[PDB]
Amino acid sequence: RWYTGRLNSWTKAVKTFSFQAVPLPGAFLSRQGGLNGGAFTATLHRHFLMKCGWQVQVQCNLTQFHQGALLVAMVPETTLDVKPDGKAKSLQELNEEQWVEMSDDYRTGKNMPFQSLGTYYRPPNWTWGPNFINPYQVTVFPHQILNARTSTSVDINVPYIGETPTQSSETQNSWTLLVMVLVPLDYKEGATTDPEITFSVRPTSPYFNGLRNRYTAG
Amino acid sequence: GPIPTAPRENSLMFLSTLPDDTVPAYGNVRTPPVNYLPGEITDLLQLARIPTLMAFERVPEPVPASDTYVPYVAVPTQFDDRPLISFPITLSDPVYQNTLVGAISSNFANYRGCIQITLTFCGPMMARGKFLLSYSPPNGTQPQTLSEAMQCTYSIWDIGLNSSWTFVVPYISPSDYRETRAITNSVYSADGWFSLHKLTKITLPPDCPQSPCILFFASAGEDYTLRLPVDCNPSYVF
Amino acid sequence: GPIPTAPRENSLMFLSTLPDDTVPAYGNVRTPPVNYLPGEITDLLQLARIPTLMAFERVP
Amino acid sequence: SNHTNVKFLFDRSRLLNVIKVLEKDAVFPRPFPTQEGAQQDDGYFCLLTPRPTVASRPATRFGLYANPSGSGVLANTSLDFNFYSLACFTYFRSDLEVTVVSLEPDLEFAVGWFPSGSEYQASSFVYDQLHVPFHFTGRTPRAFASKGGKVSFVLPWNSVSSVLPVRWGGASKLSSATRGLPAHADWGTIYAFVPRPNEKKSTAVKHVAVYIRYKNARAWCPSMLPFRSYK
Amino acid sequence: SNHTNVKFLFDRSRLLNVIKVLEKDAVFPRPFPTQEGAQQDDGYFCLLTPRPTVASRPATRFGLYANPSGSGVLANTSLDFNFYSLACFTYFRSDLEVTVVSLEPDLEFAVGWFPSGSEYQASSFVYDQLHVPFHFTGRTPRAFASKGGKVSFVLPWNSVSSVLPVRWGGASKLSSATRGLPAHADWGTIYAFVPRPNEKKSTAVKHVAVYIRYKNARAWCPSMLPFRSYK
Amino acid sequence: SNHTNVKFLFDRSRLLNVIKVLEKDAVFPRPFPTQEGAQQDDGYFCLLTPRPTVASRPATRFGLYANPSGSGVLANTSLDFNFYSLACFTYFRSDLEVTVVSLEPDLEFAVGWFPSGSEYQASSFVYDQLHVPFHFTGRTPRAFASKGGKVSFVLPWNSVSSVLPVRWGGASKLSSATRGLPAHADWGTIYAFVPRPNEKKSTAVKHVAVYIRYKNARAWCPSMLPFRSYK
Ligand SMILES: [Ca+2]
Ligand SMILES: [Ca+2]
């Protein structure tokens, strides 16, 4: 069955290489943007492993007299949730900032978690990381476009992936979504203003394993 | 065992391109099946043909971020007898660099075949227009005039409905390949210029946004071939 | 005998896992039959399945 | 040629990094964080994958000592620039060819190995007033220098994991869950030592490096590659 | 015999020239004209064709330092006297066999290569206070001395050009069109270096030469050969 | 793999122990008990089985010189920790692969052997004012160092006994019946000596060790393995 949530408004203040991202299944875990999964989401904790695909939709309001462009693409094995603070994002940070813009820290991945040296070792000069983002290369991924001249919604499906045939329900975070502004928003004044966004999801062929009680507490 | 044999001036030496293998470690080795994973990828040419974004400058963009070398261009209200955009036929330019083909070639010596050139527009759908396209082979001057472009390898794209269009270079070369590295704009590699002219000016109804945007792509064609991969540079680590 | 051949960067070296053998000592070797002895054992898994005792603490 | 054949493409050797020569049983560096006074033998336990690493242990970010002076001990890392700049794909698996490269001319040495995630313990025993680090023999092979020698060898895939993720987005542990750290994605560690007793420990200083080659690999799915600053 | 068979005739090795031994990452000589103060590392980048050449770059005329003193730096050239005196034909193509010849006795060295027209860039990185010129590993093979060693190898035709013109009458470029200079008619350049870090740079001076052999060639059309002064 | 295959499992080499280098015909250590003044040449007659042993003769208990000082001479023993910790079975038989390991760099040496229970007698004779220990030639093979060399060889089962008891409970003799001592369960003894006359006896001190490998073995019946103290 389908599941759906909401996302902020595409605003004129947003620019090219401005975006936001969503993790799978972390969206359900956080009920991100009002998202709710319910029965299977609770089942997650009672089953120590799982394996499934996905099937999604996204929507946003446009009008003929708008110009600008947006992009949607799934990307796996990313650490986009990690902030420069070194942790995944709570419900407040993205709900507040509402649109990320590219910077060297994410063009390099330097924000990834790191270790405390202790007094034993010299402090390094952080300069590089492998989880960078090169936006010019993202067209390789199959993707879909939402633009005033094109559409107001999109649909995509993806398979399961992972270094093992199945993975822990709690830790498996192979797939991540990102949505980015291809061209800044604009329209002759008075038209549909700063449309909001929504997203829908379905898993495909999900199979729970490792049956046990709900998540022996932390 | 002990028998007369043939030595070598450099027996057991190490060269980076040693062709054969050495003693193994152990038997009894077992590995798991990768069958559950999707689509092992074998060759670069498989992916190199996916349209990639170009990196055209943003016309003196005044943002404190300064330049925005970006695949798109904006629509001008005026036009001149000189292309909207022109560039030499050379793999080293930034618009080439960060493409699939550019990234590949950055670690190759020579190139052969042809590439796909894809075009795009971003304005309101109530727009009607046309554009002229001209590849300029090597000559004694970089093309400016529309008439000059018409003499060059050229075609016209209808923006009437389709806001995208494709093109493929023709492979003309006195040598089998051509030097990939931009050592100099020389007969070995450089192959002229490209040009872009708008055929007719704007046509829009009321309430439509103004001076819309134009987008472009690039990716390898079927005939493209490279030679002799080469080593990289890590300075981007900085 | 003397002929061009292939050397190695570590010819004749010793690694703990060397896979092959070397020159023998002598011929004329004879050994007695072990047939009178009971049940030569071949593999660990044969015996590993025999129930073994655990070592739970004795409550203080 | 058909160079674009990836399997053929990467089957060549390249340097990993240097390590210091050993002269006794060594204290393996402690898990982080590490404090002054917890003296340990850094710079000999040669990790075996070009991933970002630090002090014989993996790493996620890349930081280096751009400055020549400071407080504390200088760690060491390892990156395969060629392959990592050419690695526009997601998952990986292959075997690994490697060969010894001594830095000191005229060297006599012995080397050893243990596999991925294989814990280390040597200690030493006195053979007639002479300590014999247990590692002189043990579970794993060894090889020796012909007063210098190009020792070469290969190892297979070993991890319980089905494949090697080129770049990663999971979480390492149930606690202190380090993102971007797939632990079981290497081949272990080696160590080069003089064939002398601990008593024969010398004032001289020696160093050795190594070259590594990929064998019969397999690759999956796309992945990005670094951008270049336009200046 | 049937010596007159050209294919058989020239398949033998001969000296190319000497070069200086390297001890660090080097500055490739700049394009001409070059001015004093633009310090560069001349005399190590060994060009790979017996054509007239100068300072690791081709040449058209032949001029030499018949005098022992003067202002400026002394360049070096290369001519294969035997083949060039026997080359009474117009176009050419073949493969190339080559072998190392060390001039200094008792030498330990490492060598590298890159193909025709292949640009050079090494730089260096500090491995534990020790610079490691990047070229120590890279795109191209390498070979090493057994405390002295006759390293040998062969390379094929590589140029985009169909054939090699024995002597030439075209123009090199659209600007500064140098007549008599077919640029893409060689195999690249090599370089011999000590297997030591830049810090280990020594006061001693060393030199090495090389011999080159033609393999499986093909020839076309007549051509003249030098006249002799009758005195 | 099928590692659990015992026959495959143990077929690898490991250290036995060190011995002193010989420089003349030697006095074999006397049977116990031994008293001061009965001077004898301890520490060269290398026994050939990892059983507990003492002074080139077998042993039943395990005792070692945990203290660095005391009265009398320090004996030496030998235990194969790996195999003896893995030996959970009762009877055994196999062949034995062995290889030389010199401790002193740059050594020139000669070695010899005699089988299980084979009594020793060498003496020496003067070749032109130079003593020649008879053992320089004799019943058994010999091998020599190439200024250092990895001499290797194998030997078969030799004892009149049908098999080797892993651990034993019989009695050795009709008188002084030592329990736990199966005498005829080894391969003999070797000895390494300089290829010089007794007159050339030198002040320098040298040592050599050896590695031993099990070949084509056979095992019977269960047996216990050591417990571990829980602290
Ligand atoms: Ca031979
Ligand atoms: Ca040979």
Numbering used by the authors:
A (entry chain C): 62 to 279
B (entry chain B): 1 to 238
C (entry chain B): 1 to 60
D (entry chain A), E (entry chain A), F (entry chain A): 28 to 258
Quote the original article.
Seneca Valley virus (SVV) is an oncolytic picornavirus that selectively targets cancer cells by recognizing Tumor endothelial marker 8 (TEM8) as the host receptor. SVV has a typical picornavirus capsid with four capsid proteins; VP1, VP2, and VP3 are characterized by a single jelly roll fold, where eight beta-strands form a barrel-like structure that is distributed at the exterior of the virus, while VP4 is located on the interior of the capsid. The structural architecture consists of four capsid proteins forming a protomer, 5 protomers forming a pentamer, and 12 pentamers assembling into a pseudo T=3 capsid, approximately ~32 nm in diameter. We used cryo-electron microscopy to investigate SVV under acidic conditions and in complex with TEM8 at physiological pH, identifying multiple uncoating intermediates.
We also imaged SVV complexed with TEM8 under physiological conditions (pH 7 and 37°C). Although the ER-particle from both conditions remains icosahedral, there is a distinct rearrangement of pentamers. Each pentamer has rotated approximately 20° clockwise compared to its position in the F- and A-particles. As a result, the ER-particle is 8% larger than the A-particle and 14% larger than the F-particle, representing a ~44% increase in volume compared to the native state. In the ER-particle[P], these include VP1 (S1-G27), VP2 (D12-D61), and VP4. However, density corresponding to TEM8 becomes visible on the ER-particle when the map is contoured to a low threshold of 0.11. The fact that TEM8 density becomes visible on the ER-particle under physiological conditions potentially suggests that the pentamers or the receptor may adopt a more favorable conformation, enabling a more rigid receptor attachment. The receptor density on the ER-particle[P], although visible only at higher contour levels, supports the idea of functionally significant yet transient receptor interaction during capsid transition. The ER-particle has novel VP2-VP3 and VP3-VP3 contacts at the twofold axis. Overall, the SVV ER-particle is defined by rotated pentamers, an expanded capsid, reduced inter-pentamer contacts, lacks the genome, the VP1 N-terminus, VP2 N-terminus, and the whole of VP4.
